[PDB]
């Protein structure tokens, strides 16, 4: 039945019906056993699509809002703000759903270094997504929760995974975005990304046959951000 859910999740993924893909993978998480690499990946892809659609909508509506602040059309701005708020409600609901799954099911049952890093990093990501649109105390709390999770993932990654491991590199990449975009700290973002890239370069003998393309891609993205940030 676990095998059946995974199949259903793969069919939903092919059909691009990511809500159903989330439904199926959340049931697998609901089983309180260590997920396979395949299952972790399917769950992560499902929520990143579901949340990504709303993050993309939110950025569009926000940019429309900013244009109109310059034209000062107030009837328009009332409708744009109400629309944005509706999308923020969905963003909050989706983040809260996977954060619950992580706290109740995935993290407690994770028993490998790789899975622990993967799930704390996911925790880091979803609080960071809450922080993207939050203001005032909600933003401070999301930022503090994101930081705690990313630090937890980093402690484990530093002791358990080689510096070329794609989950470790993916962690460095996203934690560096966190410092840049949420904490407004280009200096710390640059340091973290540069250190992760250099530490990988120092140990390229650790690249795995299973994941060298994935490692190579994240390292290119670390470099691409360093470019963007300098």
């Amino acid at each position: 039945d676990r095998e059946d859910l995974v199949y259903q999740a793969k069919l939903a993924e092919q059909a691009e019906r990511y809500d159903e893909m989330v439904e199926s993978m959340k049931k697998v998480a609901g089983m309180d056993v260590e997920l396979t690499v395949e299952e972790r990946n399917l769950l992560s892809v499902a929520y990143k699509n579901v949340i990504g659609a709303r993050r993309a909508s939110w950025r569009i509506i926000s940019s429309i809002e900013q244009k109109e602040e310059n034209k000062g059309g107030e009837d328009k701005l009332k409708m744009i703000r109400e629309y944005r708020q509706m999308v923020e409600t969905e963003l909050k609901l989706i983040c809260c759903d996977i954060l619950d799954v992580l706290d109740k099911h995935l993290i407690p049952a994770a028993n490998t270094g790789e899975s622990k890093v993967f799930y704390y990093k996911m925790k880091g990501d979803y609080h960071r997504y809450l922080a993207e649109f939050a203001t005032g105390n909600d933003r401070k709390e999301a930022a503090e929760n994101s930081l705690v999770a990313y630090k937890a993932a980093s402690d484990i990654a530093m002791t358990e995974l080689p510096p070329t491991h794609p989950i470790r590199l993916g962690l460095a990449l996203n934690f560096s975005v966190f410092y840049y975009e949420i904490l407004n700290s280009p200096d710390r973002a640059c340091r973290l990304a540069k250190a992760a890239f250099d530490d990988a370069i120092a140990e390229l003998d650790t690249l795995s046959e299973e994941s060298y393309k994935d490692s190579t891609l994240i390292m290119q993205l670390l470099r691409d951000n360093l470019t963007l940030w300098t």
């Binding site: 990449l173 996203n174 975005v177 840049y180 994240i218 993205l221």
Partner: peptide, 8 residues
């Protein structure tokens, strides 16, 4: 506008 970890 920064790049975070991709999916697919």
């Amino acid at each position: 506008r920064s790049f975070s970890e991709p999916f697919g």
